[PDB]
Amino acid sequence: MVNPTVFFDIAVDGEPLGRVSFELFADKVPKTAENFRALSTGEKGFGYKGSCFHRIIPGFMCQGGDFTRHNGTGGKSIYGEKFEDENFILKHTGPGILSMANAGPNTNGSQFFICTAKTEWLDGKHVVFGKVKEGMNIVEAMERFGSRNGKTSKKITIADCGQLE
Amino acid sequence: XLLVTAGLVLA
């Protein structure tokens, strides 16, 4: 309706690849959208500017949003802790879907994941809060730099994050 | 299998 949109300018080793627009669902999930939008502007000191995409699996997703450790074990929410699973209204339609990663039930942090395939097995287990609005060609490009392991050959990073409307 | 966790990555 009056839903906040944010961006991600992807960088392979250092050189630009393009931006990805993200429509957040403040209408369906209020708290969870603000937890992404707050770290996308970087208005709390710590943000998505200068962040790594640790796990990237082809035909699955792009896990990122870990800055306190960059290996997958870290990250912290804007609520000064780790928040609760808001609700499981939105499902994993297919490609483009942006959902919250967790360490189990009610353990939501700063870590998220962008889907490249239909991931219905994660419904009711992960909180969906956004979809790619524009720049799906850029996501399909990030995809081919991964493996079965999740390991990134050429270190994929985010270096420019902000907000649109 | 195919999961997205933060710390203990499962099957």
Binding site: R69, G80, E81, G104 | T5, L8, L10
Partner: protein, 160 residues
């Protein structure tokens, strides 16, 4: 001397001990640690108390507080940092991680994200694929014969 810290390092942590001490006894309890923000949402809090206990009484006194955080300095080594990491998987300190001890420590971290039958299956196999001698438990010789290559020790560092 086998200790680590010097003058201004022990003096700075002495200012941090009186603030943590609610009752000012001189000994930090578990119910004194779990009052802090980023500690009630951490699975291994009770572990960094039972291992930080050179005597074993539930309370982490100032002698054990300086000696424990000493392995977390830039002046710590390899054979030392993985020794503390070995003592995580060992709750009773007998120097041998038994079959069901490994289960208990992992459930502390994993919980119900793995089913009961699942965790035991991978434990029974981790032991069969690493216990070279065949004692039914893992020592610090066998634990190092596995993890001593991924090098997690270069990150187990805090500041004075």
């Amino acid at each position: 001397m086998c200790s680590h810290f010097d003058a201004d390092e022990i003096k700075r942590l002495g200012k941090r001990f009186k603030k943590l001490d609610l009752d000012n006894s001189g000994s930090l309890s578990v119910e004194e640690f779990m009052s802090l923000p980023e500690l009630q949402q951490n699975p291994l809090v009770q572990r960094v108390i039972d291992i930080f206990d050179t005597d074993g009484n539930g309370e982490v006194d100032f002698k054990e507080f300086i000696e424990g955080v000493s392995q977390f300095s830039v002046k710590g080594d390899k054979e030392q940092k993985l020794r503390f990491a070995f003592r995580i998987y060992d709750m009773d300190k007998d120097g041998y991680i038994s079959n069901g001890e490994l289960f208990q420590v992992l459930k502390m971290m994993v919980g119900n994200n793995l089913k009961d039958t699942q965790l035991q299956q991978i434990v029974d196999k981790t032991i069969i694929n690493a216990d070279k001698d065949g004692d039914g438990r893992i020592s610090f010789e066998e634990f190092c014969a596995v993890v001593g290559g991924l090098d997690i020790h270069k990150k187990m560092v805090v500041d004075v």
